mmCIF file of N, CA and C in Angstrom:
data_model
loop_
_atom_site.group_PDB
_atom_site.id
_atom_site.type_symbol
_atom_site.label_atom_id
_atom_site.label_comp_id
_atom_site.label_asym_id
_atom_site.label_seq_id
_atom_site.Cartn_x
_atom_site.Cartn_y
_atom_site.Cartn_z
ATOM 1 N N UNK A 1 32.547 59.970 -27.160
ATOM 2 C CA UNK A 1 31.822 61.316 -26.999
ATOM 3 C C UNK A 1 32.699 62.287 -27.758
ATOM 4 N N UNK A 2 33.878 62.240 -27.677
ATOM 5 C CA UNK A 2 34.613 63.404 -28.386
ATOM 6 C C UNK A 2 34.213 63.430 -29.965
ATOM 7 N N UNK A 3 33.720 62.381 -30.348
ATOM 8 C CA UNK A 3 33.291 62.150 -31.844
ATOM 9 C C UNK A 3 31.946 62.965 -31.863
ATOM 10 N N UNK A 4 31.121 62.715 -31.073
ATOM 11 C CA UNK A 4 29.773 63.493 -31.054
ATOM 12 C C UNK A 4 30.281 64.834 -30.912
ATOM 13 N N UNK A 5 31.364 65.073 -30.355
ATOM 14 C CA UNK A 5 32.018 66.451 -30.379
ATOM 15 C C UNK A 5 32.587 66.899 -31.605
ATOM 16 N N UNK A 6 33.236 65.984 -32.352
ATOM 17 C CA UNK A 6 33.746 66.545 -33.709
ATOM 18 C C UNK A 6 32.635 66.778 -34.630
ATOM 19 N N UNK A 7 31.679 66.093 -34.452
ATOM 20 C CA UNK A 7 30.442 66.276 -35.338
ATOM 21 C C UNK A 7 29.798 67.672 -35.366
ATOM 22 N N UNK A 8 29.472 68.027 -34.019
ATOM 23 C CA UNK A 8 28.742 69.486 -33.907
ATOM 24 C C UNK A 8 29.876 70.300 -34.171
ATOM 25 N N UNK A 9 31.134 70.021 -33.921
ATOM 26 C CA UNK A 9 32.279 70.944 -34.150
ATOM 27 C C UNK A 9 32.500 71.118 -35.735
ATOM 28 N N UNK A 10 32.224 70.215 -36.349
ATOM 29 C CA UNK A 10 32.360 70.222 -37.931
ATOM 30 C C UNK A 10 31.239 71.067 -38.709
ATOM 31 N N UNK A 11 30.140 70.897 -38.117
ATOM 32 C CA UNK A 11 28.876 71.521 -38.659
ATOM 33 C C UNK A 11 29.009 73.024 -38.090
ATOM 34 N N UNK A 12 29.732 73.462 -37.231
ATOM 35 C CA UNK A 12 29.892 74.683 -36.616
ATOM 36 C C UNK A 12 30.754 75.418 -37.564
ATOM 37 N N UNK A 13 32.041 74.985 -37.731
ATOM 38 C CA UNK A 13 33.121 75.508 -38.756
ATOM 39 C C UNK A 13 32.417 75.618 -40.186
ATOM 40 N N UNK A 14 31.798 74.662 -40.511
ATOM 41 C CA UNK A 14 31.225 74.733 -42.096
ATOM 42 C C UNK A 14 30.004 75.592 -41.962
ATOM 43 N N UNK A 15 29.542 75.903 -40.944
ATOM 44 C CA UNK A 15 28.352 76.779 -40.856
ATOM 45 C C UNK A 15 28.692 78.333 -41.002
ATOM 46 N N UNK A 16 29.808 78.563 -40.458
ATOM 47 C CA UNK A 16 30.428 79.999 -40.518
ATOM 48 C C UNK A 16 31.057 80.117 -41.910
ATOM 49 N N UNK A 17 31.927 79.144 -42.383
ATOM 50 C CA UNK A 17 32.329 79.265 -43.728
ATOM 51 C C UNK A 17 31.233 79.479 -44.750
ATOM 52 N N UNK A 18 30.190 78.591 -44.996
ATOM 53 C CA UNK A 18 29.230 79.092 -45.899
ATOM 54 C C UNK A 18 27.826 79.285 -45.127
#
């Protein structure tokens, strides 16, 4: 579940970025 966690966490950082 930590991975489902790194997934949304990756789209969040990339969301702010661009």
